[PDB]
Design a protein around this ligand. Sequence first.
Ligand SMILES: NS(=O)(=O)c1ccccc1Cl
Ligand SMILES: [Zn+2]
Length: 258
Amino acid sequence: HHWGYGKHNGPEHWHKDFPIAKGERQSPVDIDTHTAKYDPSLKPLSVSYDQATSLRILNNGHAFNVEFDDSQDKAVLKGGPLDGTYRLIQFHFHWGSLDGQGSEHTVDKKKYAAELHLVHWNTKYGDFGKAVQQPDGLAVLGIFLKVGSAKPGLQKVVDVLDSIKTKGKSADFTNFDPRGLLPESLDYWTYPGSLTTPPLLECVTWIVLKEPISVSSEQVLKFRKLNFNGEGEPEELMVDNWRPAQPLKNRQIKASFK
Ligand SMILES: NS(=O)(=O)c1ccccc1Cl
Ligand SMILES: [Zn+2]
């Protein structure tokens, strides 16, 4: 049936339903740190998450989304390479079956244990659905996770996962503050790319932070106890929900730092 991450419906199949899978600005990519070019004209990123309103967390059968109220300018991203204001609509993760894999972007071929995506849409296009139809419609902030010490501001997410074990379950998830997921530094690489899941629209400015956050072994362990299937189906653990690195082709990765 439909796309997933298994042997029969995984990334090497997606192009059949989604020919853009082999397009010119696909994500994720390997970030060759020696080839990315310092661009002294990029500004500092501006993450304004003080007023963020989270609503809900949901298992959509590929990952879990923590969803925000994006009907006003309450949590925005601006600056960096971005023109205009992008509102936070959701974040999710991609993670592995083992600590040695899980991230979508890689750094000099290094795979991290998981990668967080904070998904924002350009408010000149009025909603998320219109933004994805535009070459500068989305801005995703990518943050790598490595396993070491626990990240305290992730724990509230880890502790609700038992309640959304299977596809289609959701749970109320208000008053969660995503500034607790950020690393200290905001140095980044940026390039134009795509959703890394179907429909793989080429609508994203990717902003990937150099500095990983660390989470504990028990934290990422809880991610791996999720299910891709729906309740009362045979259990397929939700792991390795990451697309591998795609050809860079005709793109340059720019760095905010030297
Ligand atoms: N993995 S991703 O590219 O951030 C993504 C996934 C689903 C919807 C929107 C986006 Cl930007
Ligand atoms: Zn993602």
